[PDB]
């Protein structure tokens, strides 16, 4: 038993982490097959980030202006293009540690594991979720740009995130592996702000379902509610409207615990309305919303 | 910026995770050089765990009774011995993915990263700390025995934990890599109980120091205190007595933030005496004690 914030094993991705330098800037790259992926703001200076015309800056860059390093082996670049907000550096030698992988754009509320990197070397790994306002609450210091977020489906590595920005509000923003930012963020140093961060309601319910299987049951009450009436309370506390799809995904958890998803929403309703009285659930004194319904069945099975 | 519960990259240890089967029981092993390490309760049945005479059970086991598997390559065992509560299975072929490593017995309060494993395959990775009562609060389902806890010092892998037991109270107990249990626990299914779990006071202070560098400062007050007077309050709330050594280890954090460690203990004193008023610190609604003073400088640098 036991329940803990878990991240996928990062070994498959450590073999793809290289260091990319362009002029004076250094960041991390992702080395799959004979291409290296990295944020396109590597071709920028600190003054450039004020307002960078990225195409004009790329006019000045040649193939030898990109120093890709994989430890003590230097990669030779033989082609470079700009796909949205990433740079596709084509190299002459394919990565021998390339795993089975796809490029996936995850949905809001979904989770992924992040491998924090600096100068192409892995530093740590932690679990992260895409907030409804398309930001993430991570750990990213200077030089962490190019670090990736991924999911591991048995053999496949579903890359979904690449770090680009830290907003002046403390949170982080980034793109998928095709270069498209998550949310209305640009790779430019300006005054950007994410929306009102809401809570992934379907994720809170799955976390409460994990608490029942572990022994934490004090929050179980004797009430029920309706999907509409629970959405009125959810909307009041800045929670995501719970849909019928969310109800179905919680099906296996509802069947295994014997607690209907509407009874669980009634217990969550009272937690939102009465707080926690100073108690904890699964070692947390607040409601955790960074475990998907699949994350709970992954650890409980 | 940002602060998150981080674990070391697990790739170096995934290359050492094999599957060990003895008769009907299956668990995980650790493959370094030409030896495989695993819990000695692999030679036990479910009835045996009631009260197992381990030496007598090992009399009946031969070298071929140990099936070590590393994916689709079977390892040939040519020697087996019992070191305390682990089994040293000597194999004829050395692990090519062996990293630089030592066997370390960590102190109470220290942290390490755990790679959860089942049938020799890695499942996830999470950060864990050795509680003062020598238990850990982890995620361990059936078949997770043999999973390891480790620290990565640049190149070296400091293995420190191997999982053995889940106590009837929900927590987990295990041994170092030399076979000695952490705490007064035996590898037998009986009524074992850890002591009164206290809080790693030096770790809470380092976490509060990390909060200052990130923007969370509301808990900063205008008080100071003495080491003795703070220990009276700490002892009341089941906290670890803070020593002068703890004060020195917090030195770099105290100097970088400009806040003396006794002023920080005064702020922590009021949090223990006034609670949190419903606020949070670094996204947590309670006091986190599973970040060492070195874990904070590791992420902030
Ligand atoms: Au960066
Ligand atoms: Au695939
Ligand atoms: Au086990
Ligand atoms: Au070493």
UniProtKB/Swiss-Prot annotation, chains A, B:
Protein name (database record): 3C-like proteinase nsp5
Role this protein plays: Cleaves the C-terminus of replicase polyprotein at 11 sites. Recognizes substrates containing the core sequence [ILMVF]-Q-|-[SGACN]. Cleaves and inactivates human TRMT1, preventing tRNA guanine(26)-dimethylation of tRNAs. May cleave human NLRP1 in lung epithelial cells, thereby activating the NLRP1 inflammasome pathway. May cleave human GSDMD, triggering alternative GSDME-mediated epithelial cell death upon activation of the NLRP1 inflammasome, which may enhance the release interleukins 1B, 6, 16 and 18. Also able to bind an ADP-ribose-1''-phosphate (ADRP).
Effect after changing residue 90 to R: In strain: Beta/B.1.351
Side of membrane Cytoplasmic, spans: 1-301
Result when mutating residue 132 to H: In strain: Omicron/BA.1, Omicron/BA.2, Omicron/BA.2.12.1, Omicron/BA.2.75, Omicron/BA.4, Omicron/BA.5, Omicron/BQ.1.1, Omicron/XBB.1.5, Omicron/EG.5.1
Subunit-level organization: 3CL-PRO exists as monomer and homodimer. Only the homodimer shows catalytic activity. Interacts with host FBXO22; this interaction promotes the proteasomal degradation of nsp5.
Originating species: Severe acute respiratory syndrome coronavirus 2 (2019-nCoV)
Regulation: Inhibited by pyridone-containing alpha-ketoamides compounds 13a and 13b. In turn, alpha-ketoamide 13b (tert-butyl (1-((S)-1-(((S)-4-(benzylamino)-3,4-dioxo-1-((S)-2-oxopyrrolidin-3-yl)butan-2-yl)amino)-3-cyclopropyl-1-oxopropan-2-yl)-2-oxo-1,2-dihydropyridin-3-yl)carbamate) inhibits SARS-CoV-2 replication in human lung cells. Inhibited ex vivo by michael acceptor inhibitor N3. Inhibited ex vivo by compound 11a and 11b.
Catalytic activity: TSAVLQ-|-SGFRK-NH2 and SGVTFQ-|-GKFKK the two peptides corresponding to the two self-cleavage sites of the SARS 3C-like proteinase are the two most reactive peptide substrates. The enzyme exhibits a strong preference for substrates containing Gln at P1 position and Leu at P2 position
Domain Peptidase C30 positions: 1-301
Subcellular location, record wording: Host cytoplasm; Host Golgi apparatus; Host nucleus
Cross-linked sites for Glycyl lysine isopeptide (Lys-Gly) (interchain with G-Cter in ubiquitin): 5, 90
Coiled coil (residue ranges): none
Positions of the catalytic residues: 41, 145
């Amino acid at each position: 038993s036991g329940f803990r914030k878990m991240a996928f094993p990062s070994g498959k991705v450590e073999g793809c982490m290289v260091q990319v330098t362009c002029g004076t800037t250094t960041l991390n790259g992702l080395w799959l097959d004979d291409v290296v992926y990295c944020p396109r703001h590597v071709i920028c200076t600190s003054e450039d980030m004020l307002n960078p015309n990225y195409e004009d800056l790329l006019i000045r860059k040649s193939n030898h202006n990109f120093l890709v390093q994989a430890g003590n082996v230097q990669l030779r670049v033989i082609g470079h293009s700009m796909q949205n907000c990433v740079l596709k550096l084509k190299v002459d030698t394919a990565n021998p540690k390339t795993p089975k992988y796809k490029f996936v754009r995850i949905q809001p509320g979904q989770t992924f594991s992040v491998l924090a990197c600096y100068n192409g070397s892995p530093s740590g790994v932690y679990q992260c979720a895409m907030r409804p306002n398309f930001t993430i609450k991570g750990s990213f210091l200077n030089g962490s740009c190019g670090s990736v977020g991924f999911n591991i489906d048995y053999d496949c590595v579903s890359f979904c995130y690449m770090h680009h920005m830290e907003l002046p509000t403390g949170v982080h923003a980034g793109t998928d592996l095709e270069g498209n930012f998550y949310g209305p963020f640009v790779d430019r140093q300006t005054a950007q702000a994410a929306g009102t961060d809401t809570t992934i309601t379907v994720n809170v319910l799955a976390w409460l379902y994990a608490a029942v299987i572990n022994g934490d049951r004090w929050f179980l009450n004797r009430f029920t509610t309706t999907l509409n009436d629970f959405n009125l309370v959810a909307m009041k506390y800045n929670y995501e409207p719970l849909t019928q799809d969310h109800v179905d995904i919680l099906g296996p958890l509802s069947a295994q615990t014997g607690i209907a998803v509407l009874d669980m929403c009634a217990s969550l309703k009272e937690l939102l309305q009465n707080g926690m009285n100073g108690r904890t659930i699964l070692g947390s004194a607040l409601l955790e919303d960074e475990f998907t319904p699949f994350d709970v069945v992954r650890q409980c099975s």
